[PDB]
Amino acid sequence: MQKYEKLEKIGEGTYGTVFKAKNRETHEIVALKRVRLDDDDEGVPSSALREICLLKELKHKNIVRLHDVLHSDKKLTLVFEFCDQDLKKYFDSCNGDLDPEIVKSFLFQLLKGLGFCHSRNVLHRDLKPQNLLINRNGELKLANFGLARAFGIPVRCYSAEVVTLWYRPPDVLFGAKLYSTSIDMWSAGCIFAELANAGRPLFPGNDVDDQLKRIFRLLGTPTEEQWPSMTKLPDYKPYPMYPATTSLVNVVPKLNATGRDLLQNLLKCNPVQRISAEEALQHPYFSDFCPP
């Protein structure tokens, strides 16, 4: 813009370029998301307008804060708070070795931000480390709402082509057209496991089939009794029955019994069985903690 001095390029987002900038009047450091409006990449403004609409209504310390939107030229500039790094880069800086208390802090803050979105009827649908911003304060912020949507209005279906593959729940992998807040709860469980280990994705599948196998191989294959509507989903196919007796101990070594119990509650295959963000924050894993 003309109110802002560009200091450097942070990277590319889902629909624009991200810069670190300084407000020439208040001297505050901000982040700018710039979006070209004279496209040859035709649909990009659409996701930006959606992000603006949602973030205007999502004001919470653990959700990245949109301050302003400027329209100045052939571009839309969104002005956000600046954050120092994303969780993916943070994993590289600390050799994927988080202290257990930072593991707890990051999950807690993620669940607070996600709880706030869910209670305001918004699904994020792109929960992954790169969409989590970290401050030197140690504050964590949910960012990048370009794939997010409001929910509640009667709808035929939602898109099943949501969430990066590694973070997508089994029901959506089986092609579920209707999902709730549960979709983001699975992804948060996936992140929890990265935090509580060595910062590598728990389920790095190469495609939908591989992804489902990875999940079932660790967690066990759900039975009809645990998940009666599983066989009725649009892209259901029979999987092998892997036992539910596989230990999580070595998969998340930073976690105690209480931590492993919360993880298993997030990583339920049946979305109806998945713990809500509100209930996860009441979990004994967070009972002796800092903020409240």
Binding site: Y15, D38, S46, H71, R120, I153
Partner: protein, 149 residues
């Protein structure tokens, strides 16, 4: 009166009543402009299915009732405004991540379209969420749309 065609007619009849200066506007004109966009997006492969559903028409009406001035001076202007509201409904409620600008743009001035987009979001972002989060508000808007016939 929960059919898509019926509600679209209700919206067309509402727009004719709202825009009193437009003496030669047919209530079928808005219906035609909306259907054309949805059909073109389908045929050109931007979407798998049509966006114009009963609930999305209620959503669009909720935007139009607050955004569209009684003082609109031309049919062309109405179309530009309505298509702005439609494009924001696609961006907010649609199942694809992006929709292109071309079917929605009827003005020579692109920058007036983006300015109107931001002005509408500034006015409506709260209600756009509320109509999802509050089923009684949705029902009230759907009832109002019906009573426009």
């Amino acid at each position: 009166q929960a059919s898509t065609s019926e509600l679209l007619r209700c919206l067309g009849e509402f727009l004719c009543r709202r825009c009193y200066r437009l003496k030669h506007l047919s209530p079928t004109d808005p219906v035609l402009w909306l259907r054309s966009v949805d059909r073109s997006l389908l045929l050109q492969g931007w979407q798998d299915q049509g966006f114009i559903t009963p609930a999305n028409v209620v959503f669009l009406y909720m935007l139009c009732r607050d955004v569209i001035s009684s003082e609109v001076g031309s049919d062309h202007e109405l179309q530009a405004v309505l298509l702005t509201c439609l494009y924001l409904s696609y961006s907010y409620m649609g199942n694809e991540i992006s929709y292109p600008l071309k079917p929605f743009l009827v003005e020579s001035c692109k920058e007036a379209f983006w300015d109107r987009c931001l002005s509408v979001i500034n006015l409506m972002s709260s209600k756009m969420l509320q109509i999802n989060a509050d089923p009684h508000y949705f029902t009230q808007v759907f009832s109002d749309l019906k009573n426009e016939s």
